């Protein structure tokens, strides 16, 4: 959509190649983000000492 | 728009052409010509086709 190309052209391109194409055009949202883990206050059920 | 449609749908037309090519011999392949000019495409039909 953004770079005006077809699915057949981008079929063989890898993640690193695709990230460069969008970044050159000015699109910065090309990265996944890891969620932050939060610990439970109590021990989970059926999970002794965990 | 025309580039995208041709990229997606060329395989179906390639199979269709090959099927009808098997009907004609090599002599008819290299000899027949559009001498009369009956099959002429209207401009409105061409741009609506793609």
Torsion angle (degrees, nearest 10) of CA B6, B9, B12, B14: 20
Residue B3: list chain A partners with CB under 8 A. 6
Return the exposure string of A5-30: e unless at least 16 CB atoms fall within 10 Å of the residue's CB, then b.
Answer: eeeeeeeeeeeeeeeebeeeeeeeee
Rounded distance between C-alpha atoms, residue A12 and residue A21, angstroms: 13
Q: Where are the alpha helices (DSSP H) in B1-50?
A: 2-21, 26-31, 43-49
- CB distance A7–B3 less than 8 Å? no
Measured from the Cβ of residue B9, the count of other Cβ atoms closer than 10 Å reads 11
Q: Alpha carbon of A8 to those of A24, A39, B9, B15, B50: distances in Å?
A: 20, 45, 11, 18, 18
A6 in contact with B, Cβ within 8 Å = yes
Q: What's the angle, vertex CA A46, arms to CA A40 and CA A48, rounded to 5?
A: 70
The C-alpha angle with vertex A20 and arms to A17 and A22, in degrees rounded to 5, equals 115
Q: Is A37 on the interface with B (CB under 8 A)?
A: no
**Cα(A4)–Cα(B20) distance, rounded to whole angstroms?**
35
Note whether B1 contacts A: Cβ–Cβ < 8 A. Answer: no
Chain A hits for B4, Cβ within 8 Å: 6
Q: Which two tokens stand for residue B42?
A: 């209207």
């Amino acid at each position: 959509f953004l770079t005006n190309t077809t699915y057949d052209i981008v079929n063989n391109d890898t993640i690193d190649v695709l990230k460069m194409k969008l970044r050159n055009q000015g699109w910065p949202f090309v990265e996944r983000y890891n969620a932050v883990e939060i610990d439970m206050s109590v021990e989970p059920l059926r999970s002794p000492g965990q | 728009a025309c580039r995208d449609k041709t990229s997606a749908n060329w395989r179906g037309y390639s199979v269709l052409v090959s099927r009808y090519r098997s009907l004609i011999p090599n002599e008819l392949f290299e000899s027949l010509r559009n001498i009369s000019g009956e099959y002429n495409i209207n401009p409105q039909d061409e741009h609506s086709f793609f």
